[PDB]
């Protein structure tokens, strides 16, 4: 009738001979169907022989059905040892502190062992949350052959692949502590890595050697930072200063709950599993404990216990385990090495979510570097050059300075404003000048000309203006997304092949465009006859081309669509209009030069559509682009 279970618990260390005996096991939650019978024993220092002998010794005829282990020790190995006994006994064992809590090799499925340390996977997740919080995107991993490697590498891989952010894994290193080195082979590899944020994984002892070596390598200093799992920090009571300062690592907190409270949790788990198993089969869990002989019969039946024991809840607190035997989500604390020997808490993390305290600059611009000179050209509706007031001596209002080698000229306009907003958003400073040779880029035989030349010569990082886009320039330099709808178009007073031949029409027809243009090059590429014919009708400048249209002596003019539309809107008389709906072939937009695949690149692009994203472009269109004509609409 009366179902009293048999249980044993051990504490090692505690910094006392006469370690606090039987502090707990006082009846709590007595309602649980099985009452615990407890035998407590302590042993001072850990050994495979001492522990094995003692645990078997307590087994005797005693027939204990469960064991909880706890230690003052920093030792990694201990957990595995007790686990081995479990494999042999099929008697459940778990541990609440220190080494037993420290991670171990994947547990044999038949075997029953549990740890109150966090899962390796969980820890890796927390390390990732920490890096994300400080937005440290780029990192590398240094690991050792100790167990959990590649469960860790895999976990990081899984956690990393899912996220949107463009984080970089730089290197992964596997070095055997065995075959200990004369070569300082670890020094030889570690020296290679250039990455700012390093994850390390190893045994408590190994971390010391790797760190001395890092200190030789120069990896601990100045901008590089290291992040660590539970194992290295261990107890956190003892810290060789071989570890660098600013070292960041996660561990379970002593302060939140003291060790006896944790032991109470363990006992509660064992007796709750016993109560649930009871409820299911009304069967006593009690089994013969003696290791030396064959495992007691019906202990083979014990498997279901593990199945029951994986998730257990008491005191409004979840003990739920994972298949490996680590608890699913114990509360965890983000810890740092405060200057000197202090381990001082930085963050709290629980379940799904993490919270951290410090705001900024935890523990020559850090975010970004260098300077960018820019070249442009003056257009009649993209950039305007103006002569500054001599009395003032310097530029006024929206006008931004630009120099031309031949004298300071003052540039203002669409490119100036778009550039200005972009500079404000991405927060960088820039030098602006004017191009000399060939304006917008031009090809004679083998060689390029214009702003593109200064982009290629690296005399310019980015080129801005009314510059159109084409396959060749996109090939040589990365272009920004088009901000405006534009292209080739026609402007006249008021595919048919009328353009294709003038000669078909008996009176001579006339049309022309500005030479050295993307338009003229495109024309020569696709339509030869038009180019060869139009060379006679080519005009010096847009104002002069306009002179050919306006005063007569030319019928039609062809040019960029944005300029032709703005000119459509702005004319001394509404004597000029666009073609059809002004719907342009070769539909394009104004882009911006960059060097190559390496550039601020995408950061620019985002900025651009944010400009339209807030609707500024419509306003800027009304101010700069909008013409008065097209008034009868």
């Amino acid at each position: 009738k009366h179902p009293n279970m048999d249980i044993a618990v051990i504490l090692v260390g505690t910094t006392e001979e006469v370690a606090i005996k039987d502090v707990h096991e006082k009846d709590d939650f007595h309602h649980l169907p099985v009452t615990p019978r407890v035998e407590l024993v302590t042993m001072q220092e850990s050994d495979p022989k001492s522990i094995i002998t003692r645990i078997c010794d307590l087994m005797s005829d005693k027939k204990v059905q469960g064991v909880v282990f706890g230690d003052d020790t920093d030792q990694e190995a201990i957990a595995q040892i007790l686990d081995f006994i479990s494999v042999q006994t099929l008697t459940p064992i778990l541990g609440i502190h220190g080494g037993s809590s420290m991670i171990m090799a994947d547990k044999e499925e038949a075997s029953m062992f549990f740890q109150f340390g966090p899962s390796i996977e969980q820890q890796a997740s927390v390390m990732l949350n920490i890096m994300e919080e400080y937005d440290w995107y780029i990192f590398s991993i240094v690991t050792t052959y100790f167990p959990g490697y590649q469960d860790f590498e895999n976990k990081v891989r899984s956690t990393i692949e899912n996220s949107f952010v463009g984080w970089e894994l730089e290197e992964v290193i596997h070095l055997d502590m065995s075959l200990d080195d004369i070569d300082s082979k670890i020094q030889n590899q570690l020296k290679k890595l250039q990455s700012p944020v390093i994850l390390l994984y190893c045994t408590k002892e190994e971390a010391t050697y790797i760190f001395e070596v890092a200190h030789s390598v120069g990896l601990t200093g100045y901008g590089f930072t290291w992040i660590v799992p539970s194992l290295v920090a261990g107890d956190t009571d003892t810290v060789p200063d071989e570890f660098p300062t600013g070292l960041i690592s996660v561990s379970y907190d002593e302060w939140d709950y003291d060790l006896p409270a944790r032991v109470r949790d363990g006992i509660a788990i064992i007796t709750t599993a016993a109560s649930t198993m009871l409820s299911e089969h009304n069967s006593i869990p009690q089994s013969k404990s003696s290791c030396n002989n064959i495992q007691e019969s019906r202990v083979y039946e014990a498997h279901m216990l593990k199945r029951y024991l994986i998730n257990v809840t008491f005191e409004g607190r979840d003990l739920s385990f994972s298949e490996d035997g680590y608890q699913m989500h114990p509360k965890l604390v983000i810890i740092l090495l405060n200057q000197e020997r202090k381990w001082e808490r930085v963050g709290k993390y629980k379940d799904r979510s993490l919270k951290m305290w410090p705001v900024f600059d935890l523990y020559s611009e850090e975010h970004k570097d260098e300077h960018l000179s820019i070249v442009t050209l003056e257009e009649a509706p993209f950039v305007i050059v103006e002569d500054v007031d001599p009395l003032s001596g310097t530029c006024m209002r929206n006008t931004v300075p630009c120099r031309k080698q031949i004298i300071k000229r003052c540039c203002k306009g669409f490119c100036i404003d778009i550039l200005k907003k972009i500079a404000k958003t991405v927060k960088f400073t820039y030098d602006l000048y004017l191009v000399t040779n060939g304006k917008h880029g031009k090809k004679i035989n083998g060689v390029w000309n214009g702003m593109i030349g200064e982009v290629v010569t690296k005399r310019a990082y980015m080129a801005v203006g009314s510059l159109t886009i084409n396959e060749e320039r996109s090939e040589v330099v990365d272009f920004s997304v088009p901000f405006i709808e534009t292209g080739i178009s026609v402007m006249v007073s008021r595919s048919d092949k009328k353009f294709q031949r003038p000669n078909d029409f008996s009176p001579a027809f006339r049309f022309g465009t500005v030479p050295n243009g993307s338009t003229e090059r495109n024309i020569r590429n696709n339509y030869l006859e038009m180019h060869s014919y139009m060379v006679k009708f080519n005009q010096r400048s847009v104002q002069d081309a306009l002179l050919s249209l306006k005063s007569g002596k030319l019928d039609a003019f062809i040019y960029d669509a944005a300029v032709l539309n703005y000119m459509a809107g702005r004319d001394e008389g509404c004597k000029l209009v666009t073609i059809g709906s002004g719907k342009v072939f070769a539909t394009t937009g104004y882009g911006i030069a960059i060097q190559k695949d390496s550039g601020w690149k995408r950061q620019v692009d985002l900025a651009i559509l944010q400009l339209f994203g807030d609707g500024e472009m419509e306003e800027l269109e009304a101010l700069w682009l909008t013409g008065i004509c097209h008034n009868e609409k």
């Binding site: 081995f84 200990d180 692009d605």
Partner: protein, 653 residues
Amino acid sequence: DPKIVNIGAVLSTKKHEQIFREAVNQANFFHFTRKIQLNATSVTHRPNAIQMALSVCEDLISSQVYAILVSHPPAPTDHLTPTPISYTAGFYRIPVIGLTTRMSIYSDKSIHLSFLRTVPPYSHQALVWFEMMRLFNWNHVILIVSDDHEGRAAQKKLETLLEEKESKADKVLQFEPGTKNLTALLLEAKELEARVIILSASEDDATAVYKSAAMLDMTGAGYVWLVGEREISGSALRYAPDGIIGLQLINGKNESAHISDAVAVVAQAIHELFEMEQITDPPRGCVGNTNIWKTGPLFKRVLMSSKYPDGVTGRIEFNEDGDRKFAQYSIMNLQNRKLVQVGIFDGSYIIQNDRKIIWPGGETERPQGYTRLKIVTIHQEPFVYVRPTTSDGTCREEYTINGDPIKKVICNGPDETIPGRPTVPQCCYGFCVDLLIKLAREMDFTYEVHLVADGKFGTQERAAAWNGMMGELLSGQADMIVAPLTINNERAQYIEFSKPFKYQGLTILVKKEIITGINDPRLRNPSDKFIYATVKQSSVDIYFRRQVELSTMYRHMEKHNYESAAEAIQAVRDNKLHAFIWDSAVLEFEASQKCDLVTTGELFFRSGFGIGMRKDSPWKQEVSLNILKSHENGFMEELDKTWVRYQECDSRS
């Protein structure tokens, strides 16, 4: 002064202990006894793991052993009975050397970091197979492994061997131990073209393997079997098939030869070791020492590099894992249901004994080696049609507009007709089907087709993989994909693409009866009032997401998306949506089909439709070669002419 340096061991019997001590004394006599001396300690195997571990900590380590030797017990209990010692010595990093443990699970340095052995594991046997495979020139094989560290390790090793070559996973087959009936898995195996087989399993499992294999007559000629030492031995030998090829490690049974040699190596290692300074004796006794032994890893390092090529066992060198290198095996044959040595393998090169080769079934000499295509599709109206087979009866005699009977084939695919979705047997007939059978008459292959479960062809999502038939192709659910698939670079890196059967580009469908360009100001001027509709996860959506230049325009399309082609055409027909965007090949046929609806503008995103295959599969090389041959004769032109009706429609204006 002399210094007595202890060694320790666990061995089968007291006689072998005497052999051990004798070998040790031979080591002492033959190397300087003035500087150093070696002392021997040993113990018989104990009934449990625990008595033995206690023996190591008490009986051995109290003697300050610099290393331990271990051998498999007289009656093997479970497996890897020398598991505990590797752990126990391992705590202190005391090097352990096994004589009889061919077990593979000790190869991982991580779990057992002190473990070295005078024998290679069962995994390393693959070195032979690759060499065997090398000679006979069969690149195509099948691998059958039990599921455990042993089998998976064997697979990893062989595959790693293959990795230097183009990686060859012709097929791989995993079964879980203790399973009496394996029949289904072999039924899957026969379908694979490669006719050569290699397997690793335990004796009991192997019995079941051969038992199941004989039922399906895979033991017959034209099939080859390659196997591990364990497979030929025991009860497995009894049920073993004729003509099988088999392996036996040399001196695997003998502990003693390995004893003399291991101790010889230990002696050489120590004498080489004491040449170095800053040495420390191993911990005295288990009790009171929580700390490792700093020398131990060094002792391991020299011992792994310890040469002494002349030995009773053969050449000695150690791989990175501490496993032995350049070991010798003796190949075995099953002739007349008895074991015979056809050849013997030593070093990196096989050696052929004078005995005649045997293959399974009757062969004087028969090195013969190396049939189905699983095809997947999607429901797309012009190139594929779906109707269920009437009752059991198969397919309709329905005839094309040009008098010909319509061809048809069976396809298993998703059904929405039932409330739950079963993979349903169906009849499917298509342009792509006629093409496929055209190939099938042209090509040696035979075809079985089932439609992909997901209505989508494929898109990257969720880690994981792109959902849809493409995902089946990488997964191998279907080895080849026949459908109307546009061909793009994002997909292209993952897989090989057949030369396009068709050339078409995207376009828009709008009802005629009262869109300027691919770039339509009307698109450019979107309206909540004027809808423009597409399918999410359609490749067009990939065009929208991948392309930066139009990236703004994507979102307007994203709104009010439809799940499938029929619904998308219907919306325009129902007039729910004013415009529909899709590639022409699917759309133009419909444009002909109704004429109430029209296609407009110029095909943009000009592309082609092609048959998907893995880059690794060479059949695609023929496929394209065939595709071109089908283009030149105008076969495609006549097929499009058949399946594009063109009957009633015109330019409306």
